[PDB]
Symmetry: D2
Subunit: 368 residues, 4 copies
């Protein structure tokens, strides 16, 4: 069964009782028992488990809540390894919340697999990896990270948001736990805040169930329905997005006002071979450098189809400046040391017409 077919018929998204072709929305809190588990959420959990070739699905009220639940698998004193370019909510939550509970985090450049091995302490219990990462799209060898984690008794976790289960399946490569900010591509319509988590480990799933039930970050039934609905067009949107990405990159790495381009499809990109060995396609997130901050602001204004926004994975294309929005708290020269130059622009390719998206960026790049 090919990929686009699995999105329509994978999982259980119908009603056995009435034959309804869509999951009923169970706005309800209690269920009567004949004598002395929301079905809408059970449907979306069934979908993510199917799409990731897992056995168990979990739906949280946000990607942040999904990550928080996974971290709570550890106790005080345990160490977790992350890719060093993590930022945003994940870095913020681990360093400013979970360290207060004795959970210690060590950031590691995981683009080199052996860096993970050097960082393993006797108290390390979890290896958490984003690939590709944000905003420079560093690629990490999923299959080797799984082998390292298994050989050292580590719970392996991959944030698969940027690739979606349509292009990258970490569970197939031996990873223990895969998770998504379903707010992005999975929902795909900028109208659901949600997290999704899949696993095949019976015992890890049981621990995840207890944590979720004891900390209460559950996804509501209305959001669960909108998630299932949006996932049904995941393959059509990702393929359209991938089509535009290839053409936009060709435009980008040929325009005089564009210096460096960051995307795993580029052959000179670090670990480009590794990405192709673990993925079927590409994320819609691209980063590129213009001359300076002044040019980046002009680019956003001259652009007609790129909306200035912070998120990604929408139907409409999004544009942003990391150095001005997500990394304005980091000192200016530390930004440069890690690549977040003042003229670095990030775009999230939507599902508009490919030629419209290529020409709109060029006519704006021509204004510099």
């Amino acid at each position: 069964m090919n990929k686009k077919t699995k999105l329509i018929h994978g999982g259980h998204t119908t009603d056995d009782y009435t034959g309804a072709v869509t999951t009923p929305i169970y706005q309800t809190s209690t269920y009567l028992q004949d004598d002395i588990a929301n079905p809408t959420r059970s449907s979306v959990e069934s979908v993510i488990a199917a799409l990731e070739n897992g056995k168990h699905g979990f739906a949280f009220s946000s990607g942040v809540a999904a990550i928080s639940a996974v971290v709570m698998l550890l106790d005080k004193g345990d160490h977790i390894i992350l890719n060093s370019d993590v930022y945003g909510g994940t870095y913020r939550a681990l360093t400013k919340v979970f360290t207060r509970f004795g959970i210690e985090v060590d950031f590691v450049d995981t683009t080199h697999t052996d860096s993970i091995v050097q960082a393993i302490r006797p108290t390390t219990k979890m290896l958490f990896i984003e690939t590709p990462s944000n905003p420079l799209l560093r690629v990490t060898d999923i299959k080797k990270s799984a082998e390292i984690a298994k050989e050292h008794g580590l719970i392996s976790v991959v944030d698969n948001t940027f690739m979606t289960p349509y292009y990258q399946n970490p569970l197939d490569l031996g990873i223990d736990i895969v998770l998504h900010s379903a707010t992005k591509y999975l929902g795909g319509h900028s109208d659901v805040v949600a997290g999704l988590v899949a696993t095949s480990d019976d015992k890890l799933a049981e621990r995840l169930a207890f944590i979720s039930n004891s900390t209460g970050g559950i996804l509501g039934p209305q959001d669960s329905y909108l998630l299932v609905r949006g996932i049904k067009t995941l393959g059509l949107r990702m393929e359209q997005i991938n089509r535009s990405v290839i053409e936009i990159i060709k435009m980008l790495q040929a325009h005089p006002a564009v210096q460096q381009v960051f995307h795993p499809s580029i052959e000179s990109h670090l670990n480009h071979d590794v990405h192709m060995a673990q993925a079927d396609g590409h994320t819609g997130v691209i980063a590129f450098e213009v001359k300076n901050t002044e040019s980046a602001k002009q680019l956003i204004k001259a652009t007609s189809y790129y909306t200035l926004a912070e998120s990604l994975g929408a139907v409409e294309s999004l544009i942003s400046v990391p150095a001005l929005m997500t990394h304005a708290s980091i000192p200016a020269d530390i930004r440069a040391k890690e690549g977040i130059t003042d003229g670095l622009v990030r775009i999230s390719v939507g599902i508009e017409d490919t030629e419209d998206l290529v020409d709109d960026l060029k006519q704006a790049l021509d204004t510099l």
Copy 2:
């Protein structure tokens, strides 16, 4: 402005943009900014803050998530005091999750105020109190607990679910943080899983905001709308429920098949004076003893308007046996030591006709 009026006009539950008399449902995840916080949830947070005479409201995906967020105000090594008859999700989460993060919990019979003072360690940071508690409805002196907590530098938290803000306002009595399982009376229609938290402390609210944003247990916009909608009839439902409670208790403490009755309205009930000094009315939860487990099961079957269910605060009345449902894991003789006798029945009074609810219980009690 009297109470029933405040439920209709307290908080901000209209749309300034269009004049809509109800809060628009913002199924959305990102908001565009002109140049380089969900309004539906902001509405329900505005309501609970108003109803509790607080300054800041917070809406979580469940009461469990609300409690979890409040506990995360502490660090590893901090101690929290609870009323010793806590059970269910709150006890389960504190003892099986948060102890793994070095947060130590000490249970205390808070029906005696001075018991709190004996239990205060140098590492105690929080005092968490349910009143009335479950299922025997023990009453705790809110005002004195607030004085103790303030005098010792303790964050004071009251679970106000059973009374609702319509009858008991812990913030008015000096408590730092008040919280609810909005799944119960506030939503009131058995169709929303939600938590609500109110405070007047600017600094506590700021810490709560960071925790909520870093752990992601947020209430969805559709559930937030249904919460605001249900709260609008809170006073009408609580007053109808209170009307039935008084009559049912009179029936209960006069029937030969009924031994002990547990409810704070009874004058011989422990701290009955204290409850009246801090409350305007009563919870719809009542506990009473029949002869044995056999009689309790017959009572549930002979009853026509009491539905066998686990929850409370619905429009329909609910019946359950704690020793068989919520406390079947505790050994049989420890149950007896704490009052959970095998023939103890708990009911949640709904909004059916009062005479219908009194006569239905009696005709069932007459079958024993």
Copy 3:
């Protein structure tokens, strides 16, 4: 089974499949059949049929659509009798739409039963009656109108919106078809636009089904759920509203700035005996006269809890001036001839505190 109990347990509003205590929301358009009718709407139709002691329920996308469907029971050439003080959507639709299809309408003062008999033509097929009517609250003898209609072979229809099924049951008095603008009291929260229609006639119900299916004005599943949810508090809201009505009228017929008061509870009101003989209570709609248009506008501004709005049956109380809003198209002196004086005010009593609602009106009436 008393009234408040029937609102909670009448009809079928649970899920047999899962035991859910609330009706699942079936956002769906097609249902699979094993080999070669929306349950959410079927639930609300079950409720209105139960509440009106009918056999068949129908849910339309608006009260206008409900009335339109009922009128389409007739063919070109058929005559329908209405109470002469009909206006708004019903009058507008019959005179400006259905007359173009050869359906002829005759308005009749039905406060006198024998007026109906004089108006019966050989081509009369339907008798349509609002009681109490708008905005002067004229009362029509339901039981006698049913006898007249049956004796002459007329389909009898009563618009029961103002009384709701909680206080008036036209089907019990022999009427063929009863209908509501569920937008008002039934939904009760100013957030659902809906119509409801109940009947016991098997053959009339079959014709209604065909019309509804052939003209497509069906109520959606989300609105159907919110309708069922709102009806559950109908008795609590109507009784609170009735409590405020009695006190407000006592205030009104004793204030010097108030001339005539229109409400069926007043003993000098026309057919006051008839209303009490067919009803258990009162509508929340009241009309009263101040001196002039200038005073009416001041009254609306000086009022703190009465919101200037056009609708009725909300949780918040509403105030309006018919001569300025619903009847500004009728010439000035025809308004006077029918009682719509320039200082006539109409209020829809909500569920705020009774004393708050009485004192707020008086302090505003004192400003004149």
Copy 4:
């Protein structure tokens, strides 16, 4: 601005007040005015007007309600011309409802443009055309029908459901009114029952507004939101569907168990040139003949990805037998006279993998 871009940015589907990227859902019935039109529905009406290059949009509670509203533009005595192969709800409503109101309907084979001219009576006021029609997909010359209608003073109406506005724009060809059963492709997810109507005529739109407001078949705000959401992927779904259609037809017109194939893409299909002159693509509906009824039932059972269902325009592919389902009421030999042979199968191509959909049908056709 190319087509896929217009689906994302055409119309107004954001919130000016907050900057929300999706239309707020206005569950509300009344809007307050400062001193003496649902925005969610206004959004979907804005979209269909934009997508069809019209000036005015209208959203109804069903396609049936949309058609009913359009027919009510006429008075008793007026004649309407339809394509003779209309059936289902449209034929049923016109012949069994609107004839009772003196609206006379004349069916005409409109595949020949001059047939319309012969059928024009002095009382003809409207020309209503489906193209392609159901289930044999007859094609009608839209541009010539518009010229005929304008030359004779006829309101021209095209049911554009099968093509969607992505492939066929009747307003651009001079048609007065275009309408859709948005339940099908526009919503596209089998979860919204809705009609949509667009026009550029200021006066026709005004009459449509009055009819809609006087008959009340309005689309709810929740359904309006789900409609806007589904339309955003219209181009991606239609193009995927069109891709599968071309390949399935090639498979179909080469399999020994398949006799006649009905689809406008086939060059021998009647008016194939006309369709290409007025359309950019194709509908997903295909009809083909197997040997007999026995083979058709085997085909449905042997098929793995075609679901036995009555509707069309879903994400999953659908299969049905007209002679057994939609035309079982017509006598057996009249079916043959009009082409509805007992072995005629109709499919609605979904968005599954193209190769999966071609191979699944062949392996099932091979079982005969």
